[PDB]
Amino acid sequence: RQPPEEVDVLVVGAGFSGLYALYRLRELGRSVHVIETAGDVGGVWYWNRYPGARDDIESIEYCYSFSEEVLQEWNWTERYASQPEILRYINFVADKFDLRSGITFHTTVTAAAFDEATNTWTVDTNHGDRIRARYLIMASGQLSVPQLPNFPGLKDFAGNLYHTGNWPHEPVDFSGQRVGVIGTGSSGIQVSPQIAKQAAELFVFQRTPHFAVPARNAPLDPEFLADLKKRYAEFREESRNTPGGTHRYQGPKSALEVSDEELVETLERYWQEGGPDILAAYRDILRDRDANERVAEFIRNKIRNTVRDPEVAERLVPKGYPFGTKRLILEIDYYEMFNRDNVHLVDTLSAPIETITPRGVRTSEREYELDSLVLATGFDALTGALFKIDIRGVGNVALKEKWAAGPRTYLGLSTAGFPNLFFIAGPGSPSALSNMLVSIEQHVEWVTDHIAYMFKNGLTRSEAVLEKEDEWVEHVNEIADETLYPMTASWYTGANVPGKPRVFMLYVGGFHRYRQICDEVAAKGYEGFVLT
Ligand SMILES: Cc1cc2nc3c(=O)[nH]c(=O)nc-3n(C[C@H](O)[C@H](O)[C@H](O)COP(=O)(O)OP(=O)(O)OC[C@H]3O[C@@H](n4cnc5c(N)ncnc54)[C@H](O)[C@@H]3O)c2cc1C
Ligand SMILES: NC(=O)c1ccc[n+]([C@@H]2O[C@H](COP(=O)([O-])OP(=O)(O)OC[C@H]3O[C@@H](n4cnc5c(N)ncnc54)[C@H](OP(=O)(O)O)[C@@H]3O)[C@@H](O)[C@H]2O)c1
Numbered sequence: 001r002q003p004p005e006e007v008d009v010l011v012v013g014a015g016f017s018g019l020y021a022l023y024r025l026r027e028l029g030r031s032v033h034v035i036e037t038a039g040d041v042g043g044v045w046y047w048n049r050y051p052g053a054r055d056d057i058e059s060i061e062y063c064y065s066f067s068e069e070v071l072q073e074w075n076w077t078e079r080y081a082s083q084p085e086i087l088r089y090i091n092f093v094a095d096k097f098d099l100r101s102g103i104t105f106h107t108t109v110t111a112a113a114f115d116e117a118t119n120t121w122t123v124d125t126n127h128g129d130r131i132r133a134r135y136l137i138m139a140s141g142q143l144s145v146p147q148l149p150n151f152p153g154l155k156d157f158a159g160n161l162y163h164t165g166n167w168p169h170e171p172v173d174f175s176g177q178r179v180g181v182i183g184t185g186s187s188g189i190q191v192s193p194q195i196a197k198q199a200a201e202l203f204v205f206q207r208t209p210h211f212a213v214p215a216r217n218a219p220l221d222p223e224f225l226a227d228l229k230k231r232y233a234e235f236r237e238e239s240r241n242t243p244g245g246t247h248r249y250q251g252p253k254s255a256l257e258v259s260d261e262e263l264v265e266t267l268e269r270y271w272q273e274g275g276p277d278i279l280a281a282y283r284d285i286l287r288d289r290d291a292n293e294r295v296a297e298f299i300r301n302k303i304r305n306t307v308r309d310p311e312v313a314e315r316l317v318p319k320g321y322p323f324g325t326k327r328l329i330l331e332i333d334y335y336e337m338f339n340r341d342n343v344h345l346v347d348t349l350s351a352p353i354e355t356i357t358p359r360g361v362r363t364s365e366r367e368y369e370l371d372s373l374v375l376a377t378g379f380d381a382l383t384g385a386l387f388k389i390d391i392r393g394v395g396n397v398a399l400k401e402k403w404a405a406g407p408r409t410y411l412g413l414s415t416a417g418f419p420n421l422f423f424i425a426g427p428g429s430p431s432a433l434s435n436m437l438v439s440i441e442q443h444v445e446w447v448t449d450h451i452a453y454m455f456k457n458g459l460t461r462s463e464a465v466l467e468k469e470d471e472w473v474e475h476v477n478e479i480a481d482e483t484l485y486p487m488t489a490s491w492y493t494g495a496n497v498p499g500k501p502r503v504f505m506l507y508v509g510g511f512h513r514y515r516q517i518c519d520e521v522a523a524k525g526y527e528g529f530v531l532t
Contacts, residue, residue, distance in 0.1 A: 003104040003129050007031045009451060010123055010133035012109045012389075015043020016437060017424040018139035019094060020066060020444045022102050028452045034103040034139075035125060041094045041103070043141055045086045048187075050167040050374075051194035053083035056186065056276060056330045057435050059220065060228060061246045062086075064093060065236040066441060072229055079217045079275075080330070104129075111390035112136060114419060119460040121420060134460065135451050138386060139424045142432055143491075145384035149182055149377040150498050153356035160372040164191055165379060174198040178369060180361055182353075183376030185210055186329045191376055193333045196343050203368050204338075205346045205353065205361060209318040211299055212331035216274025243510025245430075245438030248277045255282035255291035267298045276328050286324050286483050286508075296323040306335035313338075315347045325488040327432070381491040382427045382505050383407055393418035406494075406503035410464035410472050410528055411518060413447065419463035422447045427505040428476060432492070434511040442511075446518050450526065461532045468528035480504045 009025050011018045014036035025032035038046050055062045059076035070093060077085065094100055108126040115122060121136040123129075146165035148154065154161065162172065164187040179199040181192050184206045196202045228235060239245055255263065270278040284291040300317045307313035316335065337343050351363040360370040380387075383403060391399040394417050402408060402417065409415050412429030413422055424447070425431050425439040432439075454462055480486050486504045489495030493504050507514055521527050 001100075001104045003035060003107070003125075003131055004031070004033055005131060007033050007131065007133045008455070009033075009135045009137060010035065010121070010131055011137045011139050012036075012123075013043060013139035013141060013144075014038065014041045014099075014103050014105070015045070015139065015141060016064070016090070017043075017141070017440045017444060018137070019090070019099055020064065020441065021137050021139055021424070021448060022099055023097050024066070024444060024448045025451070026102070028448060030451065030455065032102060033131075035107050035109050035123075035129075035131075036103055036105050037108045039105050041099070042087045042090045044143065045083055045090060047144075048165055048167060049083060049169065050162075050164045050187070050191045051171075052190040052332075053164075053167075053187075054190060054215075054217075054332075055081050055086060056215075057246060058275070060225075060235075061239060061435055062437055063089070064437060064441070065233070067093075067096075068233065070096070071232040071236075075222070075225060076220055078220050080215055109140075109389055111392070113390075113392040113396075114394060114421070116394055119420065135420045135422070135454075135462075137422050137424065137447060138426075140385040140389075142382050142426060142436075143379040145380040145388065146375075147378050147380045147384075147496060148375060149353075151353055151356055156358050157356050157360075157373060158358045159360075159370055161375070162372070163375045163377070164188075174372060176200050177371040178360075179203070179372045179374065180205055180368060180370045181374045181376055182361075183378065185376060185378055186327070187378070188376035189329050189331050189334045191374060192343075193337050195374065196337050196340065199342065201342050201344065203344045203346050203361070203370070205348050206315070207348050208320070208326075209316055210326055210329055211296070211318050211323055212329040212334060213271065213276070213278060213299070214274045215330040215332045216272075217332060239435070240438055240442075240515070241512050243434070243512055244280070245435030245511045248280050251281045251283060253282050254284050254288075255294050256284070256288065258282070263294060264298065267295065271302060274330070276330060279324050279328055286322075286485065289322060289484065292322040292324070292484060299323060303335060307338050309339075312345055315345050315350075321488040322484040325485050326490040327492070378491055378496055380497050380500075381494075382431070383494075384497075386423070386426075391418070391421075393421075404501070406473075406501045407505055408469055408473050410469040411514075411521065412507065413443065413518075414462070414464040414529075416464045416466040416469045419461050422450075428472060429507050430509075430511045430514050431506045433506050433508060438511055442515055442518070446522065449522065453522075453526070454531065457531075459531045462526070463530050465528050465530055472528075476507055477503070480506075480508050483508050 008030040009032040011021045011034045059081040112123045123131045146163045175198045178201045180203045182205045304313045351365040354362045360368045387400045407427035409428035424443045494500035
């Protein structure tokens with residue numbers, strides 16, 4: 001589908017973010033078009049088609065709320081939706097609002113440059129398209145550029161190589177194979193139990209163990225759903241008015257104030273219920289090392305009790321960082337998997353990987369021969385997608401250069417020096433620290449409301465004020481430094497990627513507080529922006 005040469009708004013990306021931007025700008029009477037690398041809609045849910053791929057937020061919360069019809073018509077079937085289901089949902093939405101008519105697929109944005117003479121962006125693609133747009137919305141994701149681990153010999157491996165973030169579109173058959181998985185984040189934890197059912201032998205190459213708690217998935221009772229639908233807009237407002245964008249209970253006590261007995265009984269309740277709600281069991285879990293440690297120990301002990309061989313069990317136990325400060329993962333039959341004779345936990349803290357070889361993986365202790373190797377090694381998060389594009393602001397400043405020591409933004413939404421450019425649910429905003437459908441919807445509404453305001457008032461140039469950006473950055477850093485999150489190497493701090501600057505990238509104050517600030521900024525005529 002040939003993109004238009006001129007448009008009010010150009011949107012990069014056709015995942016949840018870009019699809020809602022497209023729809024809402026259409027409803028606002030603006031010309032808008034999307035460019036997307038993928039062959040079809042869905043973003044993460046299009047790319048991450050590995051077996052076992054599944055959301056870690058309840059289905060009834062991980063969904064769009066902008067359409068009453070969608071909320072009433074769609075039937076989720078389980079507690080946590082699988083990738084195939086979520087992709088059917090996204091297709092449903094795209095069909096319902098005729099969105100593909102406004103999207104060019106199989107096309108990658110390669111560069112974009114602001115023209116101060118015209119107050120427009122000129123955007124290039126890898127098909128030779130040149131598009132001129134007044135406003136540029138980067139809906140290009142947070143976890144959208146797969147990261148390879150930092151090991152030699154990958155190109156020499158003679159077997160089949162996969163990354164979970166670029167999985168094949170046809171099922172992959174691992175029957176009778178010796179298979180390795182590198183990475184035990186959410187992606188490794190989900191894929192490994194599925195591989196284990198086909199492989200002759202599965203080797204799981206763990207570096208730092210990640211905390212994971214049971215999902216306790218279950219079918220969603222259609223009666224509960226029908227009931228929820230009679231108050232769905234209300235239920236969703238309840239979610240928007242929280243720090244996390246879900247119904248998670250905000251435990252009012254301190255993990256230090258309670259007795260050991262009360263702690264165990266309260267944590268046991270969360271462990272049996274399943275899901276990530278334990279993160280908020282007590283108010284200070286992410287704020288006080290000793291509080292955090294009480295919870296962490298309870299979890300570590302549950303992990304130990306899951307695997308019979310106590311040497312294997314102990315190698316599964318996360319150490320050296322606070323519970324919750326790498327993103328909490330939900331597991332289904334992952335720990336149980338290691339009791340199987342054909343699954344092998346390779347502890348690469350103890351025996352670091354030296355190289356990939358034609359046959360497999362060599363650690364400092366031995367060579368593992370493999371027919372296939374699956375990389376669940378994560379993503380170049382938050383900034384990665386943007387840094388693959390040659391984005392140039394005023395005075396030919398490269399975004400990649402301005403952000404070389406970390407992302408610098410006002411509200412996460414724009415950066416000084418780069419007018420008319422907006423980032424959806426990225427650094428400087430709650431982003432992944434909230435249910436992302438809540439984060440995404442609020443960003444899309446705020447940005448598209450702003451663009452509508454500009455057009456209504458006959459303005460053409462919107463730029464974040466440098467001083468306000470510097471004050472925002474410092475503020476993000478100061479509130480993060482009251483938490484334990486900067487203490488740990490995670491993708492939230494860029495520690496994922498050799499050479500990337502280590503700074504915590506997200507707003508930790510909660511979605512609700514962030515939303516209030518955004519509302520106040522807009523109400524005052526976009527204070528901290530200069531509009532002309
Ligand atoms: C496997 C996985 C599971 C997740 N599960 C949850 C969860 O349970 N709960 C939660 O809150 N969040 C979770 N997320 C986080 C997730 O990023 C969001 O929930 C949301 O799906 C992001 O939507 P988005 O549209 O902002 O970005 P994406 O879904 O990443 O879509 C961005 C799109 O932009 C395209 N693109 C990027 N650069 C260019 C370019 N230069 N030119 C053209 N196109 C480009 C990409 O191909 C992609 O299709 C998960 C993420 C992953 C990776
Ligand atoms: N259930 C879901 O909803 C779901 C599923 C998948 C992903 N997600 C989202 O996507 C995010 C990313 O998850 P992920 O599991 O893809 O990535 P990840 O959380 O970034 O984990 C990457 C894994 O790869 C290992 N790794 C990276 N580089 C390595 C190297 N050079 N050598 C050895 N190991 C290496 C890491 O070890 P170290 O920890 O030791 O670095 C870690 O085990 C999640 O946190 C979440 O936001 C959600």
